[PDB]
Structures are given as structure tokens and as C-alpha cells.
Amino acid sequence: SGGAMHGDSLVQLSDSSFKMVKEVKKGDKVICPLLENQCVEVECVVLSKCEDGTKEFVQLGTDLWITPKHPIRVNGEWKYPKELGQTVVKTSDYIYQFVLKTGHTMNIGGYECICLGHNFQERVAYHPYLGSQAVVEDLKQMKGWKEGKVIIRSRVRDQITNQVKAFIQ
Incomplete structure (x- = not known):
């Protein structure tokens, strides 16, 4: 599966x-x-x-x-x-x-949160779009990629019911 974080969540830094x-x-x-x-x-x-x-x-x-x-x-x-x-x-x-x-x-708030493009194949982590280079190549075509900040328009889903198949902008 996949997901996203609330912006007020606290990311642990090395210092x-x-x-x-x-x-x-x-x-x-x-x-x-x-x-x-x-x-x-x-x-x-x-x-x-x-x-x-x-x-x-x-x-x-x-x-x-x-x-x-x-x-x-x-x-x-x-x-x-x-x-x-x-x-x-x-x-x-x-x-x-x-x-x-x-x-x-x-590490966000002390918990280990998966990120995009991760290649993990275990249960729950696995995602054919979000856990592969497919999502990265899509993001690479979007506005913001070079600056490192992409606002996507929608997470397109379904019949893998509700499952994300594309980010679109």
C-alpha cells in the first residue's frame, strides 16, 4: 500500500x-x-x-x-x-x-515511514506503482521535479479497488 504524511509531523534530523x-x-x-x-x-x-x-x-x-x-x-x-x-x-x-x-x-515522529520508489517486495510495503521507478519517472515529467517539489493534481486509483495507478499533474 501507500500513503502520505501530515505536514506538521516531525522528521528526526541527525543533530x-x-x-x-x-x-x-x-x-x-x-x-x-x-x-x-x-x-x-x-x-x-x-x-x-x-x-x-x-x-x-x-x-x-x-x-x-x-x-x-x-x-x-x-x-x-x-x-x-x-x-x-x-x-x-x-x-x-x-x-x-x-x-x-x-x-x-x-524516521518521522519515531516511526519508520516508507517513501516513494522503494523497491521493497514484502507484504504491505509492496506497491507496483509507488514502490517502483514508475512513479519516479512520472514525477520526473512533472513541474517541480528539478527544484525538488512537485504538487500533483490527483492520485488516480482503481480496479485494484482504490489502488493508486498514476500520479497526474
């Missing part, structure tokens, strides 16, 4: 400070727990507008609001956030996703 998701930019270094907490560079930030201005999130700890199917790695296994937290609704103009240069997970 022990935190940055909100909505402030992360290309060239920032985030922590990839699966690479032994090594730092990896952000290649592109992807924004999707919240049509109704609110979205259902799962809250994990104090510092992470994440859409309910966004894969997270807990004790070696990929899980849905809905498995681990209570659902809440939050106001959101945009929700956020990231393309990383390598590693393809990042």
Missing part, C-alpha cells in the same frame, strides 16, 4: 532536532532506520492537495499523523498505521510524500 514534514526540502538529510539510522538525501518532496481541507489520519505518538495505510516498519515487519494507532481527523491543505536518494524509509 537531534526535528523539522516539520511541510518544511523538508530537496537536499535535506533524513534518518533511514533500515540503513542503521544512516542519513539519506531527499530528492523530491511530493504534495497532494486535500480537497476537503481535512483528512483522516492515524496519530502515532505525539509527532506523527499519517494516512491509515501508509506502510511503517515495526520490529522488522511492515504494518498499516491503522493497526497501531487511533484514527483522528486533521486540517490539511496538502499531504506529503518523499523521494529519497537511497534507503527509502525515514
